[PDB]
Design a protein around this motif. Structure first.
Motif, PDB file in Angstrom:
ATOM      1  N   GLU C 192      32.009  39.535  37.730  1.00  0.00           N
ATOM      2  CA  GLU C 192      31.683  40.818  37.116  1.00  0.00           C
ATOM      3  C   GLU C 192      32.670  41.898  37.539  1.00  0.00           C
ATOM      4  N   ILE C 193      32.985  41.957  38.833  1.00  0.00           N
ATOM      5  CA  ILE C 193      33.816  43.040  39.347  1.00  0.00           C
ATOM      6  C   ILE C 193      35.224  42.958  38.771  1.00  0.00           C
ATOM      7  N   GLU C 194      35.792  41.752  38.698  1.00  0.00           N
ATOM      8  CA  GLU C 194      37.113  41.601  38.099  1.00  0.00           C
ATOM      9  C   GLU C 194      37.139  42.078  36.655  1.00  0.00           C
ATOM     10  N   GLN C 195      36.041  41.913  35.920  1.00  0.00           N
ATOM     11  CA  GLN C 195      35.968  42.397  34.548  1.00  0.00           C
ATOM     12  C   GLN C 195      35.776  43.905  34.472  1.00  0.00           C
ATOM     13  N   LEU C 196      35.043  44.494  35.421  1.00  0.00           N
ATOM     14  CA  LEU C 196      34.897  45.947  35.433  1.00  0.00           C
ATOM     15  C   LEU C 196      36.231  46.641  35.676  1.00  0.00           C
ATOM     16  N   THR C 197      37.136  46.002  36.416  1.00  0.00           N
ATOM     17  CA  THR C 197      38.399  46.608  36.809  1.00  0.00           C
ATOM     18  C   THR C 197      39.552  46.210  35.895  1.00  0.00           C
ATOM     19  N   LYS C 198      39.281  45.966  34.616  1.00  0.00           N
ATOM     20  CA  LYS C 198      40.337  45.576  33.691  1.00  0.00           C
ATOM     21  C   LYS C 198      41.216  46.769  33.341  1.00  0.00           C
ATOM     22  N   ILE C 199      42.530  46.540  33.338  1.00  0.00           N
ATOM     23  CA  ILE C 199      43.509  47.546  32.951  1.00  0.00           C
ATOM     24  C   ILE C 199      44.529  46.900  32.025  1.00  0.00           C
ATOM     25  N   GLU C 200      45.145  47.730  31.187  1.00  0.00           N
ATOM     26  CA  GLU C 200      46.207  47.242  30.320  1.00  0.00           C
ATOM     27  C   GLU C 200      47.567  47.587  30.913  1.00  0.00           C
ATOM     28  N   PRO C 201      48.566  46.712  30.808  1.00  0.00           N
ATOM     29  CA  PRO C 201      49.883  47.042  31.368  1.00  0.00           C
ATOM     30  C   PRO C 201      50.430  48.328  30.766  1.00  0.00           C
ATOM     31  N   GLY C 202      51.038  49.151  31.616  1.00  0.00           N
ATOM     32  CA  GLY C 202      51.585  50.417  31.181  1.00  0.00           C
ATOM     33  C   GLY C 202      50.570  51.520  30.991  1.00  0.00           C
ATOM     34  N   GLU C 203      49.301  51.276  31.311  1.00  0.00           N
ATOM     35  CA  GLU C 203      48.286  52.309  31.164  1.00  0.00           C
ATOM     36  C   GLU C 203      48.545  53.444  32.148  1.00  0.00           C
ATOM     37  N   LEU C 204      48.417  54.675  31.661  1.00  0.00           N
ATOM     38  CA  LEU C 204      48.675  55.840  32.493  1.00  0.00           C
ATOM     39  C   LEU C 204      47.569  56.021  33.526  1.00  0.00           C
ATOM     40  N   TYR C 205      47.954  56.530  34.694  1.00  0.00           N
ATOM     41  CA  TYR C 205      46.979  56.813  35.738  1.00  0.00           C
ATOM     42  C   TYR C 205      45.938  57.799  35.223  1.00  0.00           C
ATOM     43  N   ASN C 206      44.707  57.664  35.718  1.00  0.00           N
ATOM     44  CA  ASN C 206      43.604  58.504  35.254  1.00  0.00           C
ATOM     45  C   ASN C 206      42.561  58.552  36.368  1.00  0.00           C
ATOM     46  N   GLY C 207      42.452  59.709  37.026  1.00  0.00           N
ATOM     47  CA  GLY C 207      41.515  59.839  38.130  1.00  0.00           C
ATOM     48  C   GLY C 207      40.068  59.666  37.714  1.00  0.00           C
ATOM     49  N   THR C 208      39.690  60.223  36.562  1.00  0.00           N
ATOM     50  CA  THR C 208      38.308  60.100  36.112  1.00  0.00           C
ATOM     51  C   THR C 208      37.946  58.643  35.857  1.00  0.00           C
ATOM     52  N   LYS C 209      38.879  57.864  35.309  1.00  0.00           N
ATOM     53  CA  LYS C 209      38.603  56.449  35.090  1.00  0.00           C
ATOM     54  C   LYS C 209      38.462  55.705  36.411  1.00  0.00           C
ATOM     55  N   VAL C 210      39.236  56.092  37.426  1.00  0.00           N
ATOM     56  CA  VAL C 210      39.082  55.479  38.743  1.00  0.00           C
ATOM     57  C   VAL C 210      37.702  55.788  39.310  1.00  0.00           C
ATOM     58  N   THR C 211      37.262  57.041  39.177  1.00  0.00           N
ATOM     59  CA  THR C 211      35.926  57.401  39.637  1.00  0.00           C
ATOM     60  C   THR C 211      34.860  56.610  38.890  1.00  0.00           C
ATOM     61  N   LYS C 212      35.031  56.445  37.577  1.00  0.00           N
ATOM     62  CA  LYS C 212      34.068  55.673  36.802  1.00  0.00           C
ATOM     63  C   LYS C 212      34.054  54.214  37.240  1.00  0.00           C
ATOM     64  N   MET C 213      35.226  53.670  37.573  1.00  0.00           N
ATOM     65  CA  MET C 213      35.350  52.262  38.029  1.00  0.00           C
ATOM     66  C   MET C 213      34.629  52.113  39.367  1.00  0.00           C
ATOM     67  N   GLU C 214      34.726  53.090  40.268  1.00  0.00           N
ATOM     68  CA  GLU C 214      34.007  53.040  41.538  1.00  0.00           C
ATOM     69  C   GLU C 214      32.503  53.134  41.314  1.00  0.00           C
ATOM     70  N   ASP C 215      32.078  54.044  40.435  1.00  0.00           N
ATOM     71  CA  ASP C 215      30.651  54.195  40.173  1.00  0.00           C
ATOM     72  C   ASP C 215      30.067  52.949  39.521  1.00  0.00           C
ATOM     73  N   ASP C 216      30.821  52.301  38.634  1.00  0.00           N
ATOM     74  CA  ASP C 216      30.332  51.080  38.006  1.00  0.00           C
ATOM     75  C   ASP C 216      30.229  49.941  39.009  1.00  0.00           C
ATOM     76  N   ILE C 217      31.186  49.836  39.934  1.00  0.00           N
ATOM     77  CA  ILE C 217      31.071  48.824  40.978  1.00  0.00           C
ATOM     78  C   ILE C 217      29.857  49.101  41.854  1.00  0.00           C
ATOM     79  N   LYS C 218      29.589  50.376  42.150  1.00  0.00           N
ATOM     80  CA  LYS C 218      28.386  50.702  42.911  1.00  0.00           C
ATOM     81  C   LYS C 218      27.126  50.321  42.141  1.00  0.00           C
ATOM     82  N   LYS C 219      27.108  50.574  40.831  1.00  0.00           N
ATOM     83  CA  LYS C 219      25.916  50.277  40.041  1.00  0.00           C
ATOM     84  C   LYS C 219      25.683  48.777  39.927  1.00  0.00           C
ATOM     85  N   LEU C 220      26.754  47.992  39.794  1.00  0.00           N
ATOM     86  CA  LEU C 220      26.591  46.546  39.680  1.00  0.00           C
ATOM     87  C   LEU C 220      25.990  45.968  40.954  1.00  0.00           C
TER      88      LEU C 220
END
Lengths: 218, 65, 706, 366, 87
Positions: C192-220
């Motif tokens: 599950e965690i590897e799927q929550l942390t999916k990124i596309e090559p060349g994707e621009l950095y995004n702090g809000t998405k990182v925060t959402k990725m942390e919150d989703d890992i906490k929720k799982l």
């Protein structure tokens, strides 16, 4: 509302109105006297009269706040037992309700928060001041209140028997046996523990509860 | 506020609590230790003075002003 | 030696209690001694407090009046000058974005349009920090990983009327998110965690998405019991090639177990009324999903204003918790009484969900006049078994008299069981008996009587007809609302019907379908769009016709606001008939004994055997109510439409008159509605105007209902 | 809803003096309601002006008619321009006219053509007027950074940092040069001196006196231009003290309890200033003891004063110009030069006096 | 008879095939508690015994219960292990 006057006249009016049974006006007079002259001799007697009037007028939150003030201001005073008894009595009176009291509803399984607070306060009174004239009524109230808190525990155990949650039933009845061992609700809740133990195939543990039930039967 | 006979002094809330049944302890059968002694909801055995129910005087004590 | 009284004058924007709180911080209050030399100190202290409001030019005066017994009275006068104004907000160093659009998101404003109040040109240092954070988020979620604010300045005009704000920033450069490395003590769940942390090559950095990725890992992790995990991201920036690799540490704690779940504030609601809605239960491994599902179900129940949860940890135990639900009891139920217009005439009614906290749903009402008598009872048990099977019944006795008489009484029973978390079914049996006598002849009713085999005369008012029916009632319900009194999101659907089982005198079937759908717009759900509809249809089985006393009506405050209650739909058509009972004055001209040779049109509503209603409604906050109790009032703009038609009307014979079988004759209305949850139950006031209207319809623009 | 408290009334007086207006050339949009320091500059027989936007013009000093015009605005859309937010005072030298900006830019336009000789960035809003003397240009910015630029290139040579309090007056004090050293005032209330070559400190001192318990009670900054004569430097602060400091050592000679943001004049043994309450006073250079005081223009928000034909001249927010005479401290005459008012200091040189209104128009008065 | 909806009733201590194998005779109460976690259910009637019961009633499908009971001596040392698979 209250004309400006020296404290003596205000206190005389307050006492006259308390004797006549006019709780609201007496409360107004005593509050004015307290705010205007918090340093004078009347600083204590007005506190006691305000506690009594608030309680009688059914302004229980204000009575509780006044009791909290008084206990901190004079933690050592000849009539503290009275204030402790009034705290317990306020918490008790905060429990009952009129309508479902009239319709004969068993209020045991509603919120027990105020019952526990009142039990704590009455226990403080009785353990601290056994010679006070309020100790007997405090003991009667405690004996009733312990059985109003064991009934709530049994009420929860009955539901978790209905929903087929056996570990919850076992734990609830264990808590009853540890906290309220001698009440009637603990004797009614005991066969629920045996059924819970037998529904989980732990018969060797259910036989002990069966022995307890047998040894205490009518 | 109200007009009733001696409602100045007596408690508010009837006298239901005086009818509560007395408490009795459980007997522990042979070869077991009941856990009952582990509680803090203890009611001390006291021979203290006092009246009960509506016979009690709630009027605040008189400070020696 | 003492201050007898304290008074404030001139303060407009400041509550006097706040000034008193400030004054007591200086050691001055009623009963305290006062020193005249310190009067200036009090004035200066109060003066300095207004700087929080921005009224930097304000001044305060303190007046001390002697009183008998050496007491003094203190009076404070305030000159609340004009607050400082934001002349400009300047951002220096920004090269990628327009300074206008960066400011557009700021809470503070340097310009306010006339056509809308987007804000005020007032200044508050509290909002400046949030505004700086908003700027950082705007710059840091576009790929500018190195963004940082060098410094900020707030300036004041020499006349103390204007504010200037400057912000210095450094942009850096955009960065690409090369990859995510989630590692640590996952306790399984790597899939599950590897799927929550999916990124596309060349994707621009995004702090809000990182925060959402942390919150989703906490929720799982919280779903499986690990409701105190440690998750921490530590990006490694590479300015050499401007790629950023996002390392994420995950350390699930100990699986937690529920020791007790306790309810607080249910002063009147029985305890089991709350436990039977819970999905998390004592003595079981914890799950956050179930704990939140309990809140959702308790909210949908509708007995409580606010339901809150808590998961206090058990002291002295590493892996146990307690769950506390704190509820605020709501005044369920309704009451409504009255007196007749014009001897004794009176109406009554009481409805109670959660009757005495027992969870039952009980309702009683009736009325007694010289014309008619009517009474009804209703009792429902939502949990007749532990699973949720409900059992309820109903009785009613109706007796109307003009002459035209109609006695009716019956019974009902329904057993409804759930099929799913949100769905429900129903079934039941019913019995109804109707005795009709001396009905004045009319087409819509004589057609039905002919279908039943009765052959009453068309020119007399002395015919009677009595019937008796057994029915089978079914239904279905879908409920996913947020709350039970003022919902803000979700939808509801409720299908109901019935059909006459063999042996009933008349044969028919009937269906209805009520709907409701709330779609929130604002994030706080204060602005909501309500979509609502109703439908219906009925007809006879075999050669039987649907009884006219089961017809559909529309028009009241409940279906389409603006029209008089039950005034929409077909209108009766009276045959020329005798005055077999009496011919009163100034009344009974419709196809009466004297004159009126042919069929006479009229405006007496009779309903139809098919209905279609709809409504679009917009919900806005109440303009002049504090948020302390803004959840007991709701304001609404609505646009309602509805129609009713009689599918069996034969225009070929009654051609001279309207074709009631035409659905196209839609009514419409619009207006404003106000709703308040008074102690007597909900009260609804609404003003509407029927801007679409047909001949015979009766308009009623102001409508008040319980 | 609540109105301002104080504003004295136009004081009636006879116009024994005979002034008159001229020009009224509209430079452009003007500074409007913003607070800035866009005063004109005069050199040779031409004047220069700015317009709180890219607009810059050079007008003949004999007629008020333009000789060349330029716009420094920058595109930000198909038909949109991002304003230059030009806020630095205009100063002139050989072949260059130097300007500041609130966009952190600094411009240097050719005198004869208006074409950009060079343009560079600084450490934040260049609010103070550039000053040039026997060396580098000097600029004082809102960040407290004092920066020196090459007059012919604009490249930064050295920088100096000064503290900045939480809340300060909108403005920056122009530097003053003397014997190769530069003396300035900060927003913290200090008066600092540095050397031109590499910005090495020489001495620092404090003149602020409020020391309040809160920001505005503590709001005391040296926003005025310090002035130097005969080896002594005078400084002033918003709520501080008028003082005289030794140039060599920075020790203070004497204090006087006066506070204002407007700069002050010096002549002979007399120093004239405008108080924060808009009162006008004259003081001795010896110890600052009062000579006379004129106190009827209270809270009219006057401009900075100038010395012209022995008479002090000042504006106000109502567009009037007030003429004050040293003979008695009385008012000699009055005009209504402009409708919008004045929020920028007048300038005078070679017997010619002029002032720029809040709407962008430039007036000449004689 | 027929019945058509009931929630999932999870009761007990969450055991797994890994943790149940960690425990062995001779371990103190601290080590067992660290490995398997605090037991939700113990023997109150005067005896050191820990009941690890793992109930699962998935709707109408059925019921499964692993019962692992550990008995310690007076000193808190694990003397006997007895785990009983599904009912």
């Amino acid at each position: 509302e209250v004309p400006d006057n020296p404290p003596n006249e205000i206190y005389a009016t307050a006492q006259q109105k308390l004797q006549d049974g006019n709780w609201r006006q007496a409360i107004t007079q005593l509050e004015a006297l307290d705010n205007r002259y918090p340093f004078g001799p009347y600083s204590q007697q007005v506190q006691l009269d305000l506690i009594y009037a608030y309680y009688k007028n059914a302004d229980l939150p204000l009575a509780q706040a006044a009791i909290d003030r008084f206990i901190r201001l004079n933690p050592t005073h000849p009539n503290i037992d009275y204030v402790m008894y009034m705290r317990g009595l306020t918490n008790m009176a905060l429990d009952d309700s009129a309508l479902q009291g009239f319709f004969g509803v068993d209020r045991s399984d509603r919120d027990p928060q105020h019952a526990r607070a009142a039990f704590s306060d009455f226990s403080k009174l009785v353990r601290g001041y056994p010679n006070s004239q309020y100790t007997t009524d405090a003991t009667k109230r405690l004996v009733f209140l312990k059985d109003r808190l064991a009934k709530y525990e049994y009420s929860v155990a009955e539901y978790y028997t209905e929903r087929g949650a056996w570990v919850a039933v076992v734990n609830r009845v264990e808590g009853m046996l540890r906290d309220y061992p001698d009440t009637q609700a603990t004797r009614d809740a005991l066969p629920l523990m045996e059924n819970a133990y037998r529904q989980m195939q732990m018969n060797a543990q259910a036989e002990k509860v069966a022995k307890i039930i047998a040894a205490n039967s009518s | 506020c109200s007009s009733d006979s001696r409602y100045k002094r007596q408690v508010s809330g009837d006298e239901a609590y005086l009818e509560a049944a007395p408490l009795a302890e459980l007997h522990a059968p042979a070869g077991m230790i009941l856990p009952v002694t582990s509680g803090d909801y203890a009611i001390p055995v006291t021979n203290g003075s006092g009246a009960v129910g509506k016979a009690l005087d709630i009027r605040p004590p008189a400070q020696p002003l | 030696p003492t201050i007898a009284s304290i008074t404030f004058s001139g303060n407009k924007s400041v509550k006097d209690d706040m000034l008193k709180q400030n004054l007591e911080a200086s050691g001055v209050r009623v009963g305290e001694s006062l020193d005249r030399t310190t009067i200036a100190d009090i004035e200066k202290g109060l003066e300095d407090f207004y700087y929080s409001v921005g009224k930097y030019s304000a001044s305060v005066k303190a007046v001390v009046t002697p009183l008998p017994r050496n007491r003094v009275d203190l009076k404070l006068v305030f000159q609340e000058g004009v607050s400082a104004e934001i002349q400009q907000i300047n951002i220096v160093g920004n090269h990628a974005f327009t300074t206008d659009e960066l400011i557009s998101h700021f809470q503070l404003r340097d310009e306010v349009p006339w056509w809308n109040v987007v804000g005020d040109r007032k200044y508050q240092k509290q909002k400046l920090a949030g505004d700086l954070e908003t700027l950082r988020s705007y710059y840091l979620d576009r790929g500018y990983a190195r963004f940082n604010i060098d410094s900020t300045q707030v300036s004041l005009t020499p006349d103390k009327k204007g504010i200037y704000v400057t912000v210095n920033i450094t942009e850096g450069d955009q960065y690409k998110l090369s990859g995510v490395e989630v590692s640590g003590n996952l306790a399984g769940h790597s899939a599950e965690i590897e799927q929550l942390t999916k990124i596309e090559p060349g994707e621009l950095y995004n702090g809000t998405k990182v925060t959402k990725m942390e919150d989703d890992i906490k929720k799982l992790l919280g779903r499986y019991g690990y409701a105190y995990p440690r998750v921490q991201s530590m990006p490694e920036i590479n300015d050499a090639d401007k790629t950023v690799k996002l390392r994420v540490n995950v350390d699930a704690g100990n699986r937690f177990y529920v020791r007790k779940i306790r309810f607080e504030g249910n002063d009147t609601s029985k305890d089991a009324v709350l436990r039977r809605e819970m999905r998390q239960m004592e003595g079981a491994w914890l799950g956050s999903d179930l704990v939140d599902q309990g809140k959702e179900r308790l909210n949908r129940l509708g007995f409580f204003e606010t339901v809150d949860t808590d998961t206090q940890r058990v002291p002295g135990s590493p892996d146990q918790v307690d769950v506390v639900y704190k509820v605020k009891e709501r005044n369920t139920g309704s009451f409504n009484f009255g007196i007749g217009y014009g001897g004794v005439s009176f109406q009554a009614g009481v409805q109670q969900d959660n009757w005495l906290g027992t969870g039952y749903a009980v309702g009683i009402n009736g009325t007694k006049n010289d014309y008619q008598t009517y009474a009804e009872l209703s009792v429902t048990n939502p949990y007749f078994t532990v699973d949720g099977v409900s059992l309820g019944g109903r009785l009613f006795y109706n007796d109307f008299q003009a002459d035209y008489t109609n006695k009716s009484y019956g019974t009902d029973v329904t057993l409804g069981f759930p099929i799913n978390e949100y769905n429900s079914l129903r079934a039941g049996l019913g019995y109804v008996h109707n005795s009709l006598s001396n009905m004045q002849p009319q087409v819509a009713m004589w057609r039905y009587l002919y279908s039943m085999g009765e052959h009453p005369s068309t020119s007399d008012q002395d015919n009677s007809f009595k019937t008796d029916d057994f029915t089978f009632n079914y239904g279905w319900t879908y409920n996913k609302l947020d709350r039970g009194y003022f919902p803000t999101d979700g939808s509801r659907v409720n299908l109901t019907g019935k059909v006459t089982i063999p042996g009933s005198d008349n044969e028919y079937y009937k269906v209805t379908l009520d709907t409701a759908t709330y779609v929130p717009i604002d994030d706080d759900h204060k602005w909501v769009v309500l979509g609502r509809t109703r439908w219906g249809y009925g007809d006879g089985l075999g050669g039987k016709e649907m009884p006219f006393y089961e017809n559909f009506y529309a028009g009241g405050s409940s279906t389409v606001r603006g029209f008089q209650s039950n005034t929409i739909g077909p209108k009766a058509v009276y045959f020329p008939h005798q005055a077999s009972n009496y011919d009163p004055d100034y009344d009974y001209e419709c196809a009466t004994q004297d004159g009126a040779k042919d069929l006479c049109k009229s405006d007496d509503a009779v309903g139809g055997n098919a209905m279609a209603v709809a409504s679009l409604e917009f919900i806005t906050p109440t303009p002049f109510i504090s948020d302390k109790y803004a959840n007991s009032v709701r304001t609404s703009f609505f646009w309602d439409m509805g129609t009713v038609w009689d599918t069996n009307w034969d225009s070929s014979q009654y051609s001279g008159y309207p074709d009631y079988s035409d659905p196209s004759n839609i009514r419409m209305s619009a207006g404003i509605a106000l709703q308040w949850m008074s102690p007597l139950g909900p009260l609804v006031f609404s003003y509407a105007q029927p801007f679409k209207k047909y001949d015979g319809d009766k308009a009623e623009q102001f409508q008040f209902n319980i | 809803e609540e109105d301002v408290v104080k504003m004295s009334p136009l004081p009636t007086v006879e116009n024994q003096f005979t002034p008159t207006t001229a020009w009224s050339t509209s430079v452009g949009s003007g500074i409007g309601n913003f607070y800035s320091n866009l005063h004109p500059a005069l050199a040779d027989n031409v004047v220069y002006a700015a317009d709180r936007a890219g607009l810059v013009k050079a007008l003949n000093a004999d007629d008020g008619k333009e000789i060349w015009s330029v716009s420094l605005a920058e595109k930000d859309g198909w038909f949109s321009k991002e304003p230059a937010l030009l806020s630095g005072g205009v100063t002139v030298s050989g072949g260059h006219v130097y300007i500041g900006s609130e966009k952190a830019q600094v411009y240097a336009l050719n005198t004869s053509d208006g074409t950009v000789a060079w343009q560079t960035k600084v450490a934040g809003e260049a609010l103070s007027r550039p000053v040039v003397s026997d060396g580098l240009v000097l600029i004082h910015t809102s960040n407290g950074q004092l920066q020196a630029l090459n007059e012919a290139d604009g490249a930064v040579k050295w920088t100096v940092n000064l503290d900045m309090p939480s809340l300060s007056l909108r403005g920056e004090s122009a530097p003053t040069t003397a014997f190769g050293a530069a003396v300035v005032g900060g927003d913290n209330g200090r008066v600092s001196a540095v050397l031109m070559e590499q910005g090495q400190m020489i001495w620092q001192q404090r003149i602020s006196q409020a020391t309040g318990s809160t920001e505005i009670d503590r709001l005391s900054d040296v926003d005025t231009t310090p002035v130097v004569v005969n080896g002594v430097v005078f400084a002033l602060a918003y709520n501080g003290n008028l003082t005289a400091l030794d140039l060599r050592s920075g020790q203070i000679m004497w204090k006087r309890e006066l506070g204002s943001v407007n700069d002050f004049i010096v002549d002979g043994n007399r120093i004239y200033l405008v108080d924060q309450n808009d009162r006008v006073m004259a003081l001795t250079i010896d110890g600052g003891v009062t000579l006379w005081t004129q106190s009827d223009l209270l809270h009219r928000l006057l401009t900075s004063p100038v010395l012209y034909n022995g008479n002090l001249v000042v504006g106000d927010s109502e567009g009037y110009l007030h003429w004050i005479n040293v003979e008695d401290g009385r008012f000699v005459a009055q005009q209504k030069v402009d409708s919008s008012g004045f929020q920028t200091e007048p300038v005078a040189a070679d017997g010619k006096l002029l002032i720029q209104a809040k709407d962008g128009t430039v007036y000449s008065i004689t | 008879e027929r019945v058509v909806y009931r929630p999932d009733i999870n009761q007990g201590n969450y055991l797994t095939a890994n943790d149940v194998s960690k425990i062995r005779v001779g371990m103190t109460q601290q080590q067992v508690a660290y490995a398997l976690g605090t037991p939700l259910m113990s023997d109150p009637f005067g005896t050191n015994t820990w009941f690890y019961v793992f109930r699962q009633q998935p709707g109408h499908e059925g019921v499964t219960q692993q019962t692992l009971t550990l008995t310690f001596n007076s000193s808190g040392v694990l003397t006997n292990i007895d785990n009983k698979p599904a009912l």
